[PDB]
Design an enzyme around this catalytic site. Structure first.
Site, PDB file in Angstrom:
ATOM      1  N   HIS A  12     -30.110   3.494 -28.344  1.00 54.49           N
ATOM      2  CA  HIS A  12     -28.625   4.144 -28.693  1.00 54.49           C
ATOM      3  C   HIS A  12     -27.943   4.354 -27.105  1.00 54.49           C
ATOM      4  O   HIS A  12     -28.749   4.874 -26.401  1.00 54.49           O
ATOM      5  CB  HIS A  12     -28.669   5.426 -29.164  1.00 54.49           C
ATOM      6  CG  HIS A  12     -27.362   5.993 -29.412  1.00 54.49           C
ATOM      7  ND1 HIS A  12     -27.422   7.318 -28.963  1.00 54.49           N
ATOM      8  CD2 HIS A  12     -26.128   5.560 -29.847  1.00 54.49           C
ATOM      9  CE1 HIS A  12     -26.056   7.855 -29.246  1.00 54.49           C
ATOM     10  NE2 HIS A  12     -25.365   7.018 -29.731  1.00 54.49           N
ATOM     11  N   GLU A  32     -27.698  -0.807 -28.073  1.00 53.86           N
ATOM     12  CA  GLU A  32     -26.493  -0.576 -28.369  1.00 53.86           C
ATOM     13  C   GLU A  32     -25.732   0.085 -27.040  1.00 53.86           C
ATOM     14  O   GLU A  32     -26.336   0.801 -26.172  1.00 53.86           O
ATOM     15  CB  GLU A  32     -26.352   0.659 -29.414  1.00 53.86           C
ATOM     16  CG  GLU A  32     -25.040   0.854 -29.900  1.00 53.86           C
ATOM     17  CD  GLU A  32     -24.226   1.916 -29.373  1.00 53.86           C
ATOM     18  OE1 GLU A  32     -24.855   3.012 -28.892  1.00 53.86           O
ATOM     19  OE2 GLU A  32     -23.174   2.010 -29.250  1.00 53.86           O
ATOM     20  N   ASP A  34     -21.615   0.732 -25.516  1.00 53.00           N
ATOM     21  CA  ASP A  34     -20.334   1.239 -25.750  1.00 53.00           C
ATOM     22  C   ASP A  34     -19.214   0.491 -24.940  1.00 53.00           C
ATOM     23  O   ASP A  34     -19.291   0.703 -23.731  1.00 53.00           O
ATOM     24  CB  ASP A  34     -20.225   2.766 -25.833  1.00 53.00           C
ATOM     25  CG  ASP A  34     -21.150   3.669 -26.523  1.00 53.00           C
ATOM     26  OD1 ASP A  34     -21.197   3.616 -27.865  1.00 53.00           O
ATOM     27  OD2 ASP A  34     -22.146   4.211 -25.931  1.00 53.00           O
ATOM     28  N   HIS A  47     -20.051   5.446 -22.391  1.00 50.50           N
ATOM     29  CA  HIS A  47     -19.723   6.201 -23.691  1.00 50.50           C
ATOM     30  C   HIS A  47     -18.794   7.390 -23.249  1.00 50.50           C
ATOM     31  O   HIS A  47     -17.978   7.664 -24.001  1.00 50.50           O
ATOM     32  CB  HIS A  47     -21.153   6.819 -24.068  1.00 50.50           C
ATOM     33  CG  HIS A  47     -21.135   7.583 -25.633  1.00 50.50           C
ATOM     34  ND1 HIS A  47     -20.578   8.806 -25.594  1.00 50.50           N
ATOM     35  CD2 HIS A  47     -21.239   7.288 -26.578  1.00 50.50           C
ATOM     36  CE1 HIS A  47     -20.661   9.131 -26.726  1.00 50.50           C
ATOM     37  NE2 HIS A  47     -21.119   8.327 -27.681  1.00 50.50           N
ATOM     38  N   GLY A  48     -19.030   8.118 -22.259  1.00 51.96           N
ATOM     39  CA  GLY A  48     -18.597   9.360 -21.890  1.00 51.96           C
ATOM     40  C   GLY A  48     -19.187  10.603 -22.841  1.00 51.96           C
ATOM     41  O   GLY A  48     -19.929  10.580 -23.798  1.00 51.96           O
ATOM     42  N   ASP A  52     -24.745  12.392 -27.630  1.00 52.64           N
ATOM     43  CA  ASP A  52     -26.308  13.143 -28.023  1.00 52.64           C
ATOM     44  C   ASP A  52     -26.615  14.063 -27.135  1.00 52.64           C
ATOM     45  O   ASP A  52     -27.058  13.922 -25.886  1.00 52.64           O
ATOM     46  CB  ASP A  52     -27.039  11.898 -28.374  1.00 52.64           C
ATOM     47  CG  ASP A  52     -26.700  11.292 -29.668  1.00 52.64           C
ATOM     48  OD1 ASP A  52     -25.435  11.365 -30.032  1.00 52.64           O
ATOM     49  OD2 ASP A  52     -27.379  10.514 -29.982  1.00 52.64           O
ATOM     50  N   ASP A  91     -20.678  -1.266 -29.348  1.00 52.68           N
ATOM     51  CA  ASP A  91     -19.719  -0.393 -30.065  1.00 52.68           C
ATOM     52  C   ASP A  91     -18.404  -0.431 -29.574  1.00 52.68           C
ATOM     53  O   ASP A  91     -18.237   0.305 -28.499  1.00 52.68           O
ATOM     54  CB  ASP A  91     -20.366   0.766 -29.816  1.00 52.68           C
ATOM     55  CG  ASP A  91     -19.900   1.890 -30.880  1.00 52.68           C
ATOM     56  OD1 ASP A  91     -18.793   1.303 -31.511  1.00 52.68           O
ATOM     57  OD2 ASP A  91     -20.335   3.045 -30.841  1.00 52.68           O
ATOM     58  N   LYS A  93     -14.965   0.125 -28.657  1.00 49.48           N
ATOM     59  CA  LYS A  93     -14.013   1.101 -28.889  1.00 49.48           C
ATOM     60  C   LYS A  93     -12.575   0.922 -28.687  1.00 49.48           C
ATOM     61  O   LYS A  93     -11.879   0.937 -27.689  1.00 49.48           O
ATOM     62  CB  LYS A  93     -14.316   2.342 -27.482  1.00 49.48           C
ATOM     63  CG  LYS A  93     -15.813   2.889 -27.527  1.00 49.48           C
ATOM     64  CD  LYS A  93     -16.411   3.262 -28.636  1.00 49.48           C
ATOM     65  CE  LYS A  93     -17.869   4.030 -28.530  1.00 49.48           C
ATOM     66  NZ  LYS A  93     -18.203   5.008 -29.599  1.00 49.48           N
ATOM     67  N   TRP A 230     -27.400   5.785 -37.473  1.00 52.19           N
ATOM     68  CA  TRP A 230     -26.883   6.416 -36.403  1.00 52.19           C
ATOM     69  C   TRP A 230     -27.123   7.549 -36.932  1.00 52.19           C
ATOM     70  O   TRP A 230     -26.527   8.262 -37.779  1.00 52.19           O
ATOM     71  CB  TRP A 230     -25.478   6.156 -36.090  1.00 52.19           C
ATOM     72  CG  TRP A 230     -24.917   4.735 -35.799  1.00 52.19           C
ATOM     73  CD1 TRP A 230     -25.129   3.515 -36.676  1.00 52.19           C
ATOM     74  CD2 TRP A 230     -24.408   4.307 -34.371  1.00 52.19           C
ATOM     75  NE1 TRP A 230     -24.402   2.518 -36.348  1.00 52.19           N
ATOM     76  CE2 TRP A 230     -24.071   3.081 -34.896  1.00 52.19           C
ATOM     77  CE3 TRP A 230     -24.167   4.759 -33.568  1.00 52.19           C
ATOM     78  CZ2 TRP A 230     -23.495   1.812 -33.909  1.00 52.19           C
ATOM     79  CZ3 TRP A 230     -23.578   3.934 -32.360  1.00 52.19           C
ATOM     80  CH2 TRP A 230     -23.067   2.662 -32.781  1.00 52.19           C
ATOM     81  N   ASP A 233     -33.871  10.730 -34.148  1.00 42.62           N
ATOM     82  CA  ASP A 233     -34.800  10.784 -32.985  1.00 42.62           C
ATOM     83  C   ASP A 233     -36.153  11.518 -33.158  1.00 42.62           C
ATOM     84  O   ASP A 233     -37.120  11.521 -32.309  1.00 42.62           O
ATOM     85  CB  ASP A 233     -34.007  11.568 -31.700  1.00 42.62           C
ATOM     86  CG  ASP A 233     -32.938  11.027 -31.173  1.00 42.62           C
ATOM     87  OD1 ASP A 233     -32.903   9.592 -31.184  1.00 42.62           O
ATOM     88  OD2 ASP A 233     -32.021  11.601 -30.835  1.00 42.62           O
ATOM     89  N   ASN A 252     -32.395   7.562 -29.694  1.00 43.01           N
ATOM     90  CA  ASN A 252     -32.307   8.080 -28.245  1.00 43.01           C
ATOM     91  C   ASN A 252     -33.769   7.603 -27.799  1.00 43.01           C
ATOM     92  O   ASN A 252     -33.902   7.741 -26.447  1.00 43.01           O
ATOM     93  CB  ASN A 252     -31.786   9.423 -28.020  1.00 43.01           C
ATOM     94  CG  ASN A 252     -30.298   9.344 -28.448  1.00 43.01           C
ATOM     95  OD1 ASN A 252     -29.440   8.757 -27.816  1.00 43.01           O
ATOM     96  ND2 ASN A 252     -29.986  10.247 -29.399  1.00 43.01           N
TER      97      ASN A 252
HETATM   98 MG   LIG Z   1     -22.008   3.899 -29.217  1.00 39.85          MG
END
Ligand SMILES: [Mg+2]
Length: 285
Positions: A12, A32, A34, A47-48, A52, A91, A93, A230, A233, A252
């Site tokens: 992830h 994965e 983003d 991701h920002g 997680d 992913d 955005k 999704w 862990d 993760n």
């Molecule tokens: Mg993502």
């Protein structure tokens, strides 16, 4: 001869290229990333915050560089080749795109993947790619994407491409029927992944939602090929995910699923997917 469900162990939020080998080393057969957009332009893997718990949220790369790096790890014969690395999820955005930006964003992603991942059909990376869109209404992205690949004389690369329309989460969550129709509108008649777990505004209905998707995937006329959860862990939740019948586990900590897969009661039912497990093939029990 193996009757076990092939599982995708998706690392992830792998947005920095430095992280790629580390996550594959933990045992992920997939990752994965983003994909951020500046307008229609796919720009970073990033991701920002928030992200997680236990994760640094702001690792990043330029999209093209990330794709080029993926190519390195997934091109047979490359010094960096990992035969265990068989799929990645982008992913995408696109959630903030105006309508005019959606189709060109698909074209732009196609062009990026074509140039940087598939090297214009010249010994490109071999991994499967899931385009994950956060809005069933963004199906023109897929239409634009397909157009580019076909127009460039690389329709065959669509063999490597799958789709996950996942959202939007407002005003309401998408029904399966709505999702299926969105695929139809995208001209997508297979290579369909469904993601679940990220929304839980109604745990009873979310439990129900996942089971409904599992039932749908396994129905006679189902459209979903794979379901990935999704994220997961912990050993317990990893087992639960496998046990409910998911095909993929976004995590993760890819090492967790590796361990679970080795356990009694798991090693007889589930196994890590390899390149020869077609990610677009629904597992028939
Ligand atoms: Mg993502």
């Amino acid at each position: 001869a193996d009757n076990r469900r092939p599982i995708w162990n998706l690392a992830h939020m792998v947005n920095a290229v430095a992280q790629i080998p580390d996550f594959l080393d933990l045992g992920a057969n997939a990752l994965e990333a983003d994909v951020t957009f500046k307008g229609s332009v796919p720009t970073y893997t990033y991701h920002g915050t928030p992200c997680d718990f236990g994760r640094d949220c702001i690792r990043w790369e330029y999209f093209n560089v990330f794709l080029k790096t993926l190519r390195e790890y997934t091109t047979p014969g490359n010094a960096k080749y990992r035969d265990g690395f068989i799929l990645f999820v982008l992913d995408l955005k696109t959630g903030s795109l105006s309508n005019d930006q959606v189709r060109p964003a698909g074209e732009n992603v196609a062009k990026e993947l074509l140039q940087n991942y598939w090297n214009n059909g010249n010994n490109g990376g071999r991994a499967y790619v899931v385009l994950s869109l956060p809005d069933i209404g963004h199906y023109e992205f897929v239409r634009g994407f397909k157009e580019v690949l076909k127009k460039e004389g690389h329709e065959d690369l669509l063999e490597k491409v799958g789709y996950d329309f996942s959202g939007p989460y407002l005003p309401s969550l998408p029904t399966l029927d709505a999702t299926h129709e969105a695929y139809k509108k995208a001209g997508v008649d297979g290579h369909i992944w469904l993601s679940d777990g990220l929304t839980n505004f109604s745990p009873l209905g979310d439990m129900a939602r996942l089971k409904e998707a599992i039932k749908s995937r396994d129905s006679a006329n189902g459209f979903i090929n794979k379901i990935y959860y999704w994220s997961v862990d912990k050993v317990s939740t990893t087992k639960a995910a496998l046990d409910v019948g998911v095909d993929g586990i976004m995590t993760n900590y890819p090492n967790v699923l590796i361990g679970v897969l080795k356990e009694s009661g798991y090693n007889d039912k589930y196994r890590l997917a390899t390149y020869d497990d077609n990610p677009w093939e629904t597992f028939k029990n």
